[PDB]
Amino acid sequence: MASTTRLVNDRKQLEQQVKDDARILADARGLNITTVANDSATGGQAIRNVG
């Protein structure tokens, strides 16, 4: 029970902080949206009324 028993939590906090400041400064470069089309047809068997 000393300062050596606080290393794992220290690493957790350090990891979270590094993940945050690695993204605050990263540049924002937006991409161009493409591949948009109507390709969601639905199949099945017809009714074919008899008479």
Binding site: L7, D10, R11, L14, E15, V18, D21, L25
Partner: protein, 50 residues
């Protein structure tokens, strides 16, 4: 308990924590401004009489 595993775990944890606390964030981007090269006017044709 084996006393040769605790030392290895402590080594790994210390080394990882210290490798995490050395990396720094620094950028050198420029500004969105332009250069604004020189230019001159040009006159259009005109007709004159009196």
């Amino acid at each position: 308990p084996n006393d040769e595993a605790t030392i290895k775990a402590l080594d790994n944890v210390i080394k990882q924590i210290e490798a995490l606390s050395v990396i720094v964030n620094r950028s050198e981007k420029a500004d969105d401004a332009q250069i604004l090269g020189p230019n001159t006017y040009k006159q259009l044709l005109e007709h004159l009489f009196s």
